[PDB]
Coordinates of C-alpha atoms and ligand atoms in Angstrom, one line a residue:
Chain A
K33 CA 5.7 18.4 33.7
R34 CA 3.9 15.1 33.9
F35 CA 4.7 13.5 30.5
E36 CA 8.0 14.3 28.7
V37 CA 9.2 12.9 25.3
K38 CA 12.7 11.3 25.3
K39 CA 13.0 9.4 22.1
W40 CA 11.5 10.0 18.7
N41 CA 11.4 7.6 15.6
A42 CA 10.1 9.9 12.9
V43 CA 10.4 8.8 9.3
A44 CA 11.3 11.5 6.7
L45 CA 10.2 11.2 3.1
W46 CA 12.1 13.2 0.5
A47 CA 11.4 14.2 -3.2
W48 CA 13.8 15.8 -5.7
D49 CA 13.0 19.1 -7.5
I50 CA 10.3 17.5 -9.7
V51 CA 8.7 21.0 -10.1
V52 CA 5.1 20.2 -9.3
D53 CA 4.0 23.4 -11.1
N54 CA 5.9 22.6 -14.4
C55 CA 6.4 19.2 -15.8
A56 CA 10.2 18.9 -16.6
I57 CA 9.3 17.2 -20.0
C58 CA 6.1 19.1 -21.2
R59 CA 5.9 22.1 -18.9
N60 CA 2.2 22.0 -17.8
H61 CA 2.1 20.7 -14.2
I62 CA 2.6 17.6 -12.1
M63 CA -1.1 16.8 -12.9
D64 CA -3.9 18.2 -15.1
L65 CA -3.1 16.2 -18.3
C66 CA -0.1 16.9 -20.6
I67 CA 0.8 18.6 -24.0
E68 CA -0.5 15.7 -26.2
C69 CA -3.7 15.2 -24.1
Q70 CA -4.6 18.8 -23.3
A71 CA -8.4 18.7 -22.8
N72 CA -9.6 16.5 -19.9
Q73 CA -11.7 14.2 -22.1
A74 CA -9.9 14.5 -25.5
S75 CA -11.4 11.1 -26.3
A76 CA -9.8 9.4 -23.3
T77 CA -11.2 5.9 -24.2
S78 CA -9.9 4.3 -20.9
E79 CA -6.0 4.2 -20.9
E80 CA -4.5 6.5 -18.5
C81 CA -2.8 9.9 -18.0
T82 CA -1.5 9.7 -14.5
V83 CA 1.9 10.6 -12.9
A84 CA 4.9 8.2 -13.3
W85 CA 7.4 7.9 -10.4
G86 CA 10.9 6.7 -11.0
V87 CA 13.6 5.0 -8.8
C88 CA 15.2 8.5 -8.5
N89 CA 12.2 10.1 -6.9
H90 CA 11.4 12.1 -10.1
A91 CA 7.8 12.6 -11.2
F92 CA 6.5 13.3 -14.7
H93 CA 3.4 12.5 -16.7
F94 CA 3.4 8.9 -17.7
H95 CA 2.7 10.0 -21.4
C96 CA 5.6 12.5 -21.3
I97 CA 8.4 10.1 -20.3
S98 CA 6.8 7.2 -22.1
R99 CA 7.4 9.2 -25.3
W100 CA 10.7 10.5 -24.0
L101 CA 12.0 6.9 -23.6
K102 CA 12.2 6.9 -27.5
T103 CA 14.4 10.1 -27.5
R104 CA 16.8 9.2 -24.7
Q105 CA 17.0 6.6 -21.8
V106 CA 18.5 8.6 -18.9
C107 CA 16.2 10.8 -16.7
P108 CA 16.8 14.4 -18.1
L109 CA 17.3 16.0 -14.7
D110 CA 20.1 13.5 -13.9
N111 CA 22.1 10.6 -15.4
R112 CA 20.3 7.7 -13.9
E113 CA 18.5 4.9 -15.6
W114 CA 14.9 5.6 -15.3
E115 CA 12.6 3.0 -13.5
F116 CA 8.8 2.9 -13.1
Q117 CA 8.6 2.3 -9.4
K118 CA 5.2 4.0 -9.0
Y119 CA 2.1 5.0 -11.0
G120 CA 0.0 7.9 -10.1
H121 CA 0.4 10.6 -7.4
Chain B
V232 CA -8.2 -57.1 3.1
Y233 CA -9.2 -57.8 -0.6
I234 CA -6.0 -56.3 -1.9
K235 CA -3.9 -58.6 0.2
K236 CA -6.0 -61.7 -0.9
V237 CA -5.7 -60.8 -4.6
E238 CA -2.0 -60.2 -4.2
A239 CA -1.7 -63.6 -2.6
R240 CA -3.8 -65.2 -5.3
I241 CA -1.5 -63.6 -8.1
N242 CA 1.6 -64.8 -6.3
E243 CA 0.4 -68.5 -5.8
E244 CA -0.9 -68.5 -9.5
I245 CA 2.5 -67.3 -10.9
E246 CA 4.4 -69.7 -8.6
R247 CA 2.2 -72.6 -9.8
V248 CA 2.5 -71.6 -13.5
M249 CA 6.3 -71.2 -13.3
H250 CA 6.8 -74.4 -11.3
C251 CA 4.1 -76.7 -12.5
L252 CA 3.8 -75.6 -16.2
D253 CA 6.0 -74.7 -19.1
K254 CA 8.9 -72.2 -19.2
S255 CA 7.2 -69.0 -20.5
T256 CA 3.6 -69.8 -19.6
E257 CA 2.9 -66.5 -18.0
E258 CA 2.1 -63.7 -20.4
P259 CA -1.6 -64.6 -21.4
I260 CA -2.2 -66.1 -17.8
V261 CA -1.2 -62.9 -16.0
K262 CA -2.9 -60.6 -18.6
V263 CA -6.2 -62.4 -18.4
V264 CA -6.1 -62.7 -14.6
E265 CA -5.3 -58.9 -14.4
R266 CA -8.2 -58.2 -16.8
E267 CA -10.6 -60.3 -14.8
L268 CA -9.7 -59.1 -11.3
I269 CA -8.3 -55.6 -11.4
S270 CA -10.3 -54.3 -14.4
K271 CA -13.5 -55.3 -12.7
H272 CA -12.7 -54.3 -9.1
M273 CA -11.0 -51.0 -10.2
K274 CA -14.3 -49.0 -10.7
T275 CA -16.2 -50.1 -7.5
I276 CA -13.7 -51.0 -4.7
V277 CA -12.1 -47.5 -4.6
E278 CA -15.1 -45.2 -4.4
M279 CA -18.3 -47.0 -3.2
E280 CA -18.0 -47.0 0.7
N281 CA -16.6 -48.7 3.8
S282 CA -12.9 -47.9 3.7
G283 CA -12.3 -47.6 0.0
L284 CA -9.6 -45.1 -1.3
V285 CA -10.9 -41.8 0.1
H286 CA -11.3 -43.4 3.6
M287 CA -8.1 -45.2 3.6
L288 CA -6.4 -41.9 2.7
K289 CA -8.2 -39.7 5.2
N290 CA -7.2 -41.8 8.2
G291 CA -3.7 -42.0 7.0
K292 CA -2.9 -45.6 6.1
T293 CA 0.5 -45.6 4.5
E294 CA 0.6 -49.4 3.9
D295 CA -2.7 -49.4 2.2
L296 CA -1.7 -46.6 -0.2
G297 CA 1.6 -48.3 -0.9
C298 CA 0.1 -51.8 -1.7
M299 CA -2.6 -50.2 -3.8
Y300 CA -0.1 -48.3 -5.9
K301 CA 2.1 -51.4 -6.3
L302 CA -0.9 -53.5 -7.4
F303 CA -2.7 -51.1 -9.7
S304 CA 0.5 -50.2 -11.4
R305 CA 0.5 -53.4 -13.4
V306 CA -2.8 -52.8 -15.1
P307 CA -3.3 -49.8 -17.5
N308 CA -5.8 -47.1 -16.7
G309 CA -5.5 -47.9 -13.0
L310 CA -3.2 -44.9 -12.0
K311 CA -5.5 -42.7 -14.1
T312 CA -8.7 -43.4 -11.9
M313 CA -6.4 -43.6 -8.8
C314 CA -5.2 -40.0 -9.4
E315 CA -8.8 -38.9 -10.5
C316 CA -10.2 -40.1 -7.1
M317 CA -7.3 -38.5 -5.3
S318 CA -8.0 -35.2 -7.0
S319 CA -11.7 -35.4 -6.2
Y320 CA -10.8 -36.0 -2.5
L321 CA -8.3 -33.0 -2.7
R322 CA -11.0 -30.8 -4.2
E323 CA -13.4 -31.8 -1.4
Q324 CA -10.9 -31.0 1.3
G325 CA -9.9 -27.8 -0.2
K326 CA -13.5 -26.6 -0.5
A327 CA -14.0 -27.6 3.0
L328 CA -10.9 -25.6 3.9
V329 CA -11.0 -22.6 1.5
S330 CA -14.7 -21.9 2.5
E331 CA -15.3 -18.2 2.7
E332 CA -18.7 -18.2 4.3
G333 CA -18.1 -17.1 7.8
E334 CA -16.1 -14.3 9.4
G335 CA -13.6 -14.8 12.2
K336 CA -10.9 -17.0 10.6
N337 CA -7.3 -16.5 11.5
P338 CA -5.2 -16.1 8.3
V339 CA -2.1 -17.5 9.9
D340 CA -4.0 -20.5 11.0
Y341 CA -5.5 -21.0 7.6
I342 CA -2.1 -21.0 5.9
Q343 CA -0.6 -23.2 8.5
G344 CA -3.4 -25.8 8.0
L345 CA -3.1 -25.6 4.2
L346 CA 0.7 -26.1 4.5
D347 CA 0.1 -29.0 6.9
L348 CA -2.3 -30.7 4.4
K349 CA 0.3 -30.1 1.6
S350 CA 3.1 -31.6 3.7
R351 CA 0.9 -34.7 4.6
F352 CA 0.0 -35.3 1.1
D353 CA 3.7 -34.9 0.0
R354 CA 4.7 -37.4 2.7
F355 CA 2.0 -39.9 1.6
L356 CA 3.3 -39.6 -2.0
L357 CA 6.9 -40.1 -1.0
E358 CA 6.0 -43.0 1.1
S359 CA 3.6 -44.9 -1.1
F360 CA 3.7 -43.6 -4.7
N361 CA 7.4 -43.7 -5.0
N362 CA 7.5 -40.2 -6.4
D363 CA 5.3 -41.0 -9.4
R364 CA 5.1 -38.1 -12.0
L365 CA 1.4 -38.6 -12.6
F366 CA 0.5 -38.1 -9.0
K367 CA 2.7 -35.0 -8.7
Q368 CA 1.2 -33.5 -11.8
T369 CA -2.4 -34.2 -10.6
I370 CA -1.8 -32.7 -7.1
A371 CA -0.1 -29.6 -8.7
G372 CA -3.1 -29.2 -11.0
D373 CA -5.6 -29.6 -8.0
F374 CA -3.7 -27.0 -5.9
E375 CA -3.7 -24.6 -8.9
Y376 CA -7.5 -25.1 -9.4
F377 CA -8.6 -24.9 -5.8
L378 CA -6.1 -22.2 -4.4
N379 CA -7.2 -19.4 -6.7
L380 CA -10.9 -20.0 -5.7
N381 CA -10.6 -17.0 -3.3
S382 CA -8.8 -13.6 -4.1
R383 CA -7.5 -13.3 -0.4
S384 CA -5.5 -16.6 -0.6
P385 CA -2.2 -14.8 -1.5
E386 CA -3.0 -12.2 1.2
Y387 CA -3.4 -15.0 3.8
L388 CA -0.1 -16.6 2.6
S389 CA 1.6 -13.2 3.0
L390 CA 0.2 -12.8 6.5
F391 CA 1.4 -16.3 7.4
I392 CA 4.9 -15.7 6.1
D393 CA 5.0 -12.4 8.0
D394 CA 3.9 -14.2 11.2
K395 CA 6.7 -16.8 10.6
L396 CA 9.2 -14.1 9.8
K397 CA 8.6 -11.6 12.6
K398 CA 10.0 -13.9 15.3
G399 CA 11.1 -17.5 15.4
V400 CA 9.7 -18.3 18.8
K401 CA 8.4 -21.5 17.4
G402 CA 11.4 -23.6 16.0
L403 CA 14.3 -21.8 17.5
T404 CA 16.9 -23.8 15.5
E405 CA 17.3 -23.3 11.8
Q406 CA 16.5 -26.8 10.3
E407 CA 12.7 -26.6 11.0
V408 CA 12.7 -23.0 9.9
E409 CA 14.3 -24.0 6.6
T410 CA 11.9 -26.9 6.1
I411 CA 8.8 -24.7 6.8
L412 CA 10.0 -22.0 4.4
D413 CA 10.7 -24.6 1.7
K414 CA 7.2 -26.0 2.3
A415 CA 5.7 -22.4 2.1
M416 CA 7.4 -21.6 -1.1
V417 CA 6.4 -25.0 -2.6
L418 CA 2.8 -24.1 -1.7
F419 CA 3.2 -20.7 -3.2
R420 CA 4.5 -22.4 -6.4
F421 CA 1.0 -23.8 -7.2
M422 CA -0.6 -20.4 -6.9
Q423 CA -1.7 -17.7 -9.3
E424 CA -2.2 -13.9 -8.9
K425 CA 1.3 -13.1 -7.9
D426 CA 0.8 -9.3 -8.2
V427 CA -1.4 -9.2 -5.0
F428 CA 1.1 -11.5 -3.3
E429 CA 4.1 -9.3 -4.1
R430 CA 2.0 -6.2 -3.1
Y431 CA 1.1 -7.6 0.3
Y432 CA 4.7 -9.0 0.8
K433 CA 6.0 -5.5 0.3
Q434 CA 3.4 -4.0 2.7
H435 CA 4.5 -6.6 5.3
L436 CA 8.1 -5.7 4.7
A437 CA 7.2 -2.0 5.3
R438 CA 5.3 -2.9 8.5
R439 CA 8.3 -5.1 9.9
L440 CA 11.1 -2.7 8.9
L441 CA 9.4 0.6 10.1
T442 CA 8.8 -1.0 13.5
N443 CA 11.0 -2.4 16.2
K444 CA 14.1 -3.8 14.5
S445 CA 16.2 -7.0 15.3
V446 CA 13.4 -9.3 14.2
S447 CA 15.7 -12.0 12.6
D448 CA 18.6 -9.9 11.1
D449 CA 19.5 -12.9 8.9
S450 CA 16.2 -15.0 8.3
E451 CA 14.9 -11.9 6.4
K452 CA 17.9 -12.5 3.9
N453 CA 17.1 -16.2 3.8
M454 CA 13.5 -15.3 2.7
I455 CA 14.7 -12.9 0.1
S456 CA 16.9 -15.7 -1.3
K457 CA 13.9 -18.1 -1.5
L458 CA 11.7 -15.5 -3.2
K459 CA 14.5 -14.7 -5.8
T460 CA 14.8 -18.4 -6.6
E461 CA 11.0 -18.8 -6.9
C462 CA 9.4 -15.5 -8.2
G463 CA 12.4 -14.7 -10.4
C464 CA 14.8 -11.6 -10.9
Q465 CA 11.9 -9.1 -10.6
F466 CA 10.7 -7.4 -7.4
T467 CA 13.1 -9.2 -4.9
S468 CA 15.7 -6.8 -6.5
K469 CA 13.4 -3.8 -5.6
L470 CA 13.1 -5.1 -2.1
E471 CA 17.0 -5.2 -2.0
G472 CA 17.0 -1.5 -3.2
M473 CA 14.5 -0.7 -0.4
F474 CA 17.0 -2.4 2.1
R475 CA 19.9 -0.3 0.6
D476 CA 17.8 2.8 1.0
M477 CA 17.2 1.9 4.7
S478 CA 21.0 1.4 5.1
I479 CA 21.6 4.8 3.7
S480 CA 18.9 6.3 6.0
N481 CA 20.5 4.8 9.3
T482 CA 24.1 5.7 8.2
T483 CA 23.0 9.3 7.6
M484 CA 21.0 9.5 10.8
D485 CA 23.9 8.6 13.0
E486 CA 26.3 10.8 11.0
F487 CA 23.9 13.8 11.4
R488 CA 23.8 13.1 15.1
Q489 CA 27.5 13.0 15.4
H490 CA 27.6 16.3 13.5
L491 CA 25.1 17.8 15.9
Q492 CA 27.1 16.6 18.9
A493 CA 30.1 18.4 17.6
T494 CA 28.1 21.5 17.1
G495 CA 26.5 21.1 20.6
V496 CA 23.4 23.1 19.6
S497 CA 20.9 20.2 19.3
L498 CA 18.2 21.4 21.8
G499 CA 14.9 19.7 20.7
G500 CA 17.2 17.0 19.3
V501 CA 17.8 14.5 22.2
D502 CA 17.8 10.7 21.7
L503 CA 16.3 11.1 18.2
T504 CA 16.0 8.4 15.4
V505 CA 15.1 9.9 12.0
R506 CA 14.7 7.5 9.0
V507 CA 15.0 8.8 5.4
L508 CA 13.0 7.0 2.8
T509 CA 12.2 7.5 -0.9
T510 CA 8.7 8.0 -2.2
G511 CA 8.8 5.3 -4.9
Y512 CA 9.7 2.5 -2.6
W513 CA 7.3 3.1 0.3
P514 CA 3.7 4.2 -0.8
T515 CA 2.1 7.1 0.9
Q516 CA 0.0 6.1 3.9
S517 CA -3.3 7.9 3.1
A518 CA -2.9 11.6 2.3
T519 CA 0.3 12.6 4.0
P520 CA -1.3 13.7 7.4
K521 CA -0.5 17.1 9.2
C522 CA -1.2 18.3 12.8
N523 CA 0.5 20.5 15.5
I524 CA 3.9 18.8 16.2
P525 CA 5.0 18.9 19.9
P526 CA 7.5 21.7 20.5
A527 CA 10.8 19.8 21.2
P528 CA 10.1 17.2 18.3
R529 CA 9.1 20.1 16.0
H530 CA 12.6 21.8 16.4
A531 CA 14.4 18.4 15.9
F532 CA 12.4 17.9 12.7
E533 CA 13.1 21.5 11.5
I534 CA 16.9 21.1 12.1
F535 CA 16.8 17.7 10.1
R536 CA 14.9 19.4 7.3
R537 CA 17.5 22.1 7.2
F538 CA 20.2 19.4 7.0
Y539 CA 18.5 17.7 4.1
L540 CA 17.6 20.9 2.2
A541 CA 21.2 22.0 2.3
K542 CA 23.6 19.1 1.9
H543 CA 21.3 17.2 -0.5
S544 CA 19.9 20.6 -1.7
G545 CA 16.5 19.5 -3.2
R546 CA 15.2 16.8 -0.8
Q547 CA 11.6 18.0 0.1
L548 CA 11.2 16.8 3.6
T549 CA 7.4 16.3 3.8
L550 CA 6.0 16.0 7.4
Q551 CA 3.7 13.1 8.2
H552 CA 2.3 11.2 11.2
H553 CA 1.1 7.8 10.3
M554 CA 4.5 6.1 10.8
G555 CA 7.2 5.7 13.5
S556 CA 6.9 5.5 17.3
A557 CA 8.2 7.3 20.4
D558 CA 9.1 6.7 24.0
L559 CA 7.2 8.9 26.4
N560 CA 8.8 9.3 29.8
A561 CA 6.0 9.4 32.5
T562 CA 6.2 9.8 36.2
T587 CA 6.0 5.9 42.6
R588 CA 8.5 5.5 39.8
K589 CA 9.4 6.7 36.4
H590 CA 7.7 4.4 33.8
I591 CA 8.4 5.2 30.2
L592 CA 5.3 4.8 27.9
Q593 CA 5.2 4.3 24.1
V594 CA 3.3 6.3 21.4
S595 CA 3.2 5.4 17.7
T596 CA 3.3 9.0 16.5
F597 CA -0.5 9.1 17.0
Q598 CA -1.1 10.0 20.6
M599 CA 1.8 12.4 20.8
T600 CA -0.2 15.5 20.0
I601 CA -3.2 14.7 22.2
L602 CA -1.0 13.9 25.2
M603 CA 1.0 17.1 24.5
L604 CA -2.3 19.1 24.6
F605 CA -3.1 17.2 27.8
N606 CA 0.3 18.3 29.2
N607 CA -0.3 21.9 28.2
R608 CA -3.8 21.7 29.7
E609 CA -5.8 18.8 31.1
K610 CA -9.6 18.4 31.2
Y611 CA -10.1 18.3 27.4
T612 CA -12.7 16.6 25.2
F613 CA -13.3 15.8 21.6
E614 CA -14.1 19.3 20.7
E615 CA -10.8 20.6 22.2
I616 CA -8.8 18.0 20.2
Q617 CA -10.8 18.6 17.0
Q618 CA -10.8 22.4 17.1
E619 CA -7.3 23.5 18.0
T620 CA -5.4 20.5 16.4
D621 CA -6.4 20.5 12.6
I622 CA -6.2 16.6 12.7
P623 CA -7.5 14.2 10.1
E624 CA -11.0 12.9 10.5
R625 CA -10.9 9.0 11.0
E626 CA -7.3 8.3 11.9
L627 CA -7.9 10.7 14.9
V628 CA -10.9 8.6 16.2
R629 CA -8.8 5.4 15.7
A630 CA -6.1 6.8 18.0
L631 CA -8.7 8.1 20.4
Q632 CA -10.3 4.7 20.8
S633 CA -6.9 3.0 20.9
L634 CA -6.2 5.2 23.9
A635 CA -9.5 4.8 25.8
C636 CA -12.0 2.4 24.2
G637 CA -11.6 -1.3 24.6
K638 CA -8.4 -1.2 26.7
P639 CA -7.4 -3.8 29.3
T640 CA -6.5 -2.9 32.9
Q641 CA -3.5 -0.7 31.7
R642 CA -5.5 2.5 31.0
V643 CA -3.3 5.4 30.4
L644 CA -6.1 7.7 29.3
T645 CA -9.5 7.2 31.2
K646 CA -12.9 9.1 30.9
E647 CA -15.9 9.6 33.1
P648 CA -18.6 8.7 30.5
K649 CA -17.8 5.0 30.3
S650 CA -19.3 3.9 27.0
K651 CA -18.4 1.9 23.9
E652 CA -19.3 4.7 21.4
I653 CA -17.4 7.9 21.2
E654 CA -19.2 11.0 22.3
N655 CA -18.3 14.7 22.0
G656 CA -18.3 16.2 25.5
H657 CA -16.3 13.6 27.5
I658 CA -13.5 14.6 29.8
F659 CA -10.3 12.6 29.7
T660 CA -8.2 11.6 32.8
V661 CA -5.1 9.5 33.5
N662 CA -4.6 6.5 35.8
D663 CA -1.6 5.0 37.6
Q664 CA -2.0 1.3 36.6
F665 CA 0.8 -0.2 38.6
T666 CA 0.3 -3.5 36.7
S667 CA 3.3 -2.6 34.6
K668 CA 6.2 -4.6 36.1
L669 CA 8.9 -2.6 34.2
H670 CA 9.8 0.9 33.2
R671 CA 9.2 0.3 29.4
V672 CA 5.5 -0.4 29.0
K673 CA 4.1 0.0 25.5
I674 CA 0.6 0.3 24.2
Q675 CA 0.4 -2.0 21.2
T676 CA -3.3 -1.5 20.2
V677 CA -2.1 -1.3 16.6
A678 CA -1.5 -4.4 14.5
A679 CA -4.5 -6.2 16.1
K680 CA -6.2 -9.3 14.8
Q681 CA -6.4 -9.3 11.0
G682 CA -9.7 -7.7 10.1
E683 CA -8.9 -6.7 6.5
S684 CA -11.8 -4.3 6.4
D685 CA -13.9 -3.5 3.3
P686 CA -12.4 0.0 2.6
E687 CA -8.8 -1.0 2.7
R688 CA -9.5 -4.2 0.7
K689 CA -11.3 -2.1 -2.0
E690 CA -8.5 0.4 -2.2
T691 CA -5.7 -2.2 -2.4
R692 CA -7.8 -4.0 -5.1
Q693 CA -8.0 -0.7 -7.1
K694 CA -4.2 -0.2 -6.6
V695 CA -3.4 -3.7 -7.8
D696 CA -5.9 -3.2 -10.7
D697 CA -3.9 -0.1 -11.8
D698 CA -0.7 -2.1 -11.2
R699 CA -2.0 -4.8 -13.7
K700 CA -3.0 -2.0 -16.0
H701 CA 0.5 -0.5 -16.2
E702 CA 2.0 -4.1 -16.2
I703 CA 0.2 -4.9 -19.5
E704 CA 1.0 -1.7 -21.1
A705 CA 4.6 -1.7 -20.3
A706 CA 5.0 -5.2 -21.6
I707 CA 3.1 -4.5 -24.8
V708 CA 5.3 -1.4 -25.4
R709 CA 8.5 -3.2 -24.5
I710 CA 7.9 -6.5 -26.5
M711 CA 5.9 -5.4 -29.6
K712 CA 8.5 -2.8 -30.6
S713 CA 10.8 -5.8 -31.8
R714 CA 8.0 -8.2 -32.8
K715 CA 5.5 -8.7 -35.7
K716 CA 2.1 -7.1 -36.1
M717 CA -1.4 -8.7 -35.4
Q718 CA -4.5 -8.7 -37.5
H719 CA -7.3 -9.5 -35.1
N720 CA -6.1 -11.6 -32.1
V721 CA -2.5 -12.6 -32.8
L722 CA -0.3 -10.6 -30.4
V723 CA -2.8 -10.9 -27.6
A724 CA -2.0 -14.6 -27.3
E725 CA 1.7 -13.7 -27.0
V726 CA 1.1 -10.9 -24.4
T727 CA -1.1 -13.4 -22.4
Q728 CA 1.5 -16.1 -22.5
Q729 CA 4.2 -13.6 -21.3
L730 CA 1.8 -12.8 -18.4
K731 CA 0.6 -16.3 -17.9
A732 CA 2.8 -16.8 -14.7
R733 CA 1.8 -13.3 -13.5
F734 CA -2.0 -13.3 -13.3
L735 CA -5.2 -13.9 -15.2
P736 CA -5.2 -12.7 -18.9
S737 CA -8.4 -10.6 -18.3
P738 CA -9.3 -10.6 -22.1
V739 CA -12.0 -7.9 -21.7
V740 CA -9.6 -5.6 -19.8
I741 CA -6.7 -5.9 -22.2
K742 CA -9.0 -5.6 -25.2
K743 CA -10.4 -2.3 -23.8
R744 CA -7.0 -1.0 -22.9
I745 CA -5.1 -1.8 -26.2
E746 CA -7.6 0.4 -28.1
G747 CA -7.0 3.5 -26.1
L748 CA -3.5 4.2 -27.5
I749 CA -4.8 5.0 -30.8
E750 CA -5.4 8.6 -29.9
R751 CA -1.7 9.6 -30.4
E752 CA 1.7 8.5 -31.7
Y753 CA 4.1 5.7 -30.8
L754 CA 2.2 2.7 -32.3
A755 CA -1.3 4.0 -32.5
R756 CA -2.4 0.6 -33.7
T757 CA -4.9 1.9 -36.3
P758 CA -8.1 -0.2 -36.0
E759 CA -9.6 0.2 -39.4
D760 CA -6.2 -0.2 -41.1
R761 CA -5.3 -3.3 -39.1
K762 CA -2.9 -4.4 -41.8
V763 CA 0.4 -2.7 -41.0
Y764 CA 1.4 -1.2 -37.7
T765 CA 3.7 1.8 -37.3
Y766 CA 7.1 0.4 -36.5
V767 CA 8.4 3.7 -35.4
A768 CA 9.1 5.6 -32.2
Ligands
LIG801 ZN1 4.2 16.5 -18.7
LIG802 ZN1 -1.4 12.6 -21.6
LIG803 ZN1 15.6 11.2 -12.5

């Protein structure tokens, strides 16, 4: 051949079993609102109902784990202190 | 020359009064002499014209500044107008420097000039004003007032620090590097809107760590120390977590290579270098791109995906293309090219069959829209005499039916020639600026809500505008209060539980969970 690849420097991103189809706290989805918001509008009045990403690569609705912080303080699928490293998908 | 003359007059008057008159003899004499001379010359001699205060400061006359400071210090309200005029000159210079009208300014040069001006003013202060507190306060206030005039000032500071950190070709030794870093952090001290600064610093960290390594290997840590001491125990810890994640990635990559060497079954896996990162630390590039991966690379990635889905059962190895690089071995000698994971698919298609066009690479490739054209022009359009992908229809604009060819280009004097079309002159185009502005707006939106839900759970309640002052004071060192944004966002939480903050019954808030 005329051109051949010798080295590769790909970067691999990983995500845990967040279950994009069932929120691990509310069991609706990784998007499309939550149990306490339901309808899309539901008198939104600004604020937000996006996805929250932790330091453990877990994803839930911001509302779900914001409320869950009052029940416990360690991400339910593990035993790690939950951070708020990202907001939204 | 008037200041020297009046100083001599004061000296001779005090000498005469202390030698030719009574023992004390000096309080009313010196008071009235000052009130006549300085209190009348103060208003007009420093601002009118013909080498007053602004002109004697612009040219850099240290002795004039020192003697003016030592003379006007005796009379009250002299330092006040001195600092007022100095602040006016500083505002004029900043407006002349922070001017936004006109495109084509180098951010690194702009930050270098601003830091040079700051260092010059600091040197003048130290040499003449004897480190007076009033002058320092006035210059700090002037810097705070004039620096936040533009919203791309922290971005330009981040670009300057990235340029200084990528390679220490200027100032090889450590003393000048330490001094310039101290000056840079001092300049950053009198700056607002720290959120965009942190965001762009993290983006620069991602750019400098996901590219060729061995940039400083110790000055990066010096800079983390500086930011920790300045910004605080906040996001410098998150950058340390990012560095720990990078360490995990490299230690696991070499371990997996060693395990594959023992197996002796790594076919597509040759001299590979796979980095494992976490979603939270590094933002997704645009939309996680996808396209036909060259055969050998594809196999390597599939084996690595098996390794991650089995040992760390759960790690979803998502494929992407807007990151990384590669070394393409071409072949009169064997010169190795370089592809930044963008031209690999197009060149592989060329290897499979030459004489292709835009339609061929847009039909049997399933490649994103614009990042494809960016790589296509990085390969052919606007390329110096090192062309690795030539075309017959020589034109600036990109057509559809254009055939692609290859050239020798013996100008490369080595076997490792790279095409660094990316990371060009800082253009900071409108779409990327708008999207990062929206991202930082959402960042502020969560930053205010997290603070209000973390603080107010252990605090008192507000009636109309009590707790908003506290929440703005807590974020005073972060960014602007944005009263309308916080007012519109605090009233959205009433729709559900956990401190609904009832508007009509604004007398007692639910202190529950
Ligand atoms: Zn949920
Ligand atoms: Zn919700
Ligand atoms: Zn977790």
